[PDB]
Structure formats: C-alpha cells, structure tokens
Amino acid sequence: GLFGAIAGFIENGWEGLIDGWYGFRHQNAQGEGTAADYKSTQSAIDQITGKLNRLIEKTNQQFELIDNEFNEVEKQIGNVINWTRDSITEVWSYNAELLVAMENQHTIDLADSEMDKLYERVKRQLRENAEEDGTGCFEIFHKCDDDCMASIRNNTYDHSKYREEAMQNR
Amino acid sequence: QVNGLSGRIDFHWLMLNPNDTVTFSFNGAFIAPDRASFLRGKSMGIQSGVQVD
Numbered sequence: 728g729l730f731g732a733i734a735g736f737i738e739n740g741w742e743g744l745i746d747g748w749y750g751f752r753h754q755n756a757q758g759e760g761t762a763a764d765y766k767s768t769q770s771a772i773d774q775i776t777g778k779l780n781r782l783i784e785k786t787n788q789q790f791e792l793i794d795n796e797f798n799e800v801e802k803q804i805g806n807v808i809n810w811t812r813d814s815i816t817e818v819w820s821y822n823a824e825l826l827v828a829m830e831n832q833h834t835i836d837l838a839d840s841e842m843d844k845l846y847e848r849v850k851r852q853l854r855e856n857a858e859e860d861g862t863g864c865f866e867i868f869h870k871c872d873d874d875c876m877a878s879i880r881n882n883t884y885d886h887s888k889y890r891e892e893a894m895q896n897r
Numbered sequence: 898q899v900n901g902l903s904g905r906i907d908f909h910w911l912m913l914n915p916n917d918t919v920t921f922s923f924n925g926a927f928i929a930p931d932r933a934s935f936l937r938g939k940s941m942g943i944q945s946g947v948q949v950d
C-alpha cells in the first residue's frame with residue numbers, strides 16, 4: 728500500500744488472530760503469548776463503517792415512466808428517449824466503477840495507515856529500551872516478563888525504570 | 898375489419914383550466930362526452946405481469 732506496513736516490511740498477517748484486526752505477539756522467557764490491540768481495530772472499523780453509512784442509503788427522488796412496454800411510443804421521440812437513457816446509464820456506470828475503485832484504494836491505504844500508527848506508537852513507548860527489527864518486531868534488551876508486556880499493551884510502560892539495563896546491554 | 902367492424906372511433910382530450918369554459922360546435926360525427934373527469938391526488942403507475950402482494 729501507500730504506507731508499506733501491510734504487505735510491506737511486515738511479511739504477512741496472522742490467521743490465528745481472531746480477536747481484533749491488529750495485535751501484538753511476544754516471545755519471552757515465560758513462553759509465547761499473543762493478543763489484539765483494540766484502539767486501532769476500533770479506529771479502522773469505525774472509519775470503514777463510516778464509508779458504508781455514506782454509501783448504503785437511497786435517494787428520495789422519484790422517477791416516472793416516459794415510455795411504454797406494451798405499446799411502443801412514436802419512433803422519433805422513442806429513439807431520443809432511448810438515447811438519453813443510454814447516455815445516463817453510461818454515466819452512472821462510470822461513476823459507480825470509479826467510486827468503488829477509489830473507495831477500495833483508500834480503504835486499503837487506510838488500514839495500512841493504522842498499522843503504521845500502532846507500530847510508530849510502540850516505537851515511541853520503548854524510547855531507548857529496544858531496537859528496530861526490520862520485520863515489525865521490537866528487540867527488547869531488558870528482561871520483560873508477561874506483566875511488563877501487558878504494561879506495553881496498556882501503554883502503562885515506564886521506560887525510565889527499565890532504562891539502565893537495556894542501555895548497558897546495548 | 899377489427900372485431901368484425903370497419904368503423905373507427907378515435908378519442909381526443911384537453912385539460913380545461915379551473916374557472917374556464919370549453920365550447921363544442923359540431924355538424925355531426927361527434928362522440929359527445931357526458932362526464933368530465935378530475936384528478937384525486939398523487940399516485941404511481943407501473944406496467945407488470947406479476948401478482949400483487
């Protein structure tokens with residue numbers, strides 16, 4: 728996409744993840760554990776449903792009948808009518824195809840965007856206590872357990888407490 | 898012959914404005930009206946070959 732997070736440096740997604748859209752997956756001394764992040768999920772979801780709300784609704788404008796199916800109208804005015812209706816039908820087909828194509832492009836780039844926003848959030852929680860993997864992982868240096876991880880995923884993580892160790896272990 | 902008849906009777910119509918006067922003069926061959934019609938309000942009109950529901 729435009730942000731190179733989804734189908735970018737993050738190699739792929741996690742079919743095992745069914746809790747939300749984006750999440751964390753950690754492997755520390757106390758074994759592997761993975762769970763989803765709610766704020767980003769609800770952001771992207773509320774935006775996509777915003778698009779649907781703007782689309783899924785109908786006009787109140789009412790159109791009458793100008794021709795006849797059983798008893799064909801006069802030939803000239805009928806050819807003018809069919810010419811007008813064909814031109815309009817053509818226009819609405821173009822408008823529809825363009826609309827859907829651009830709403831899809833924007834949707835994809837928006838989910839990509841929310842991913843980059845979560846990664847760049849954590850990257851700023853772990854100021855100097857971690858190093859950039861390159862595949863969307865964060866190589867911590869201090870001994871972060873299954874409770875310090877849950878302090879990351881709540882943003883309650885204090886980097887000054889665990890700064891000494893991770894700094895020295897550079 | 899159309900329904901076994903060769904005659905024809907063809908119909909014409911005009912909308913008379915409120916507080917207006919229509920006036921016929923005729924020499925014959927005239928299918929005269931007995932009842933003017935008025936519109937009741939608003940409606941839709943469709944053409945179909947399926948049942949109501």
Ligand SMILES: *[C@@H]1O[C@H](CO)[C@@H](O)[C@H](O)[C@H]1NC(C)=O
Pocket residue numbers: 916917918
């Ligand atoms: C229509 O209005 C005119 C003048 O306002 C009047 O002379 C005439 O009699 C009216 N017609 C009827 C049918 O009342």
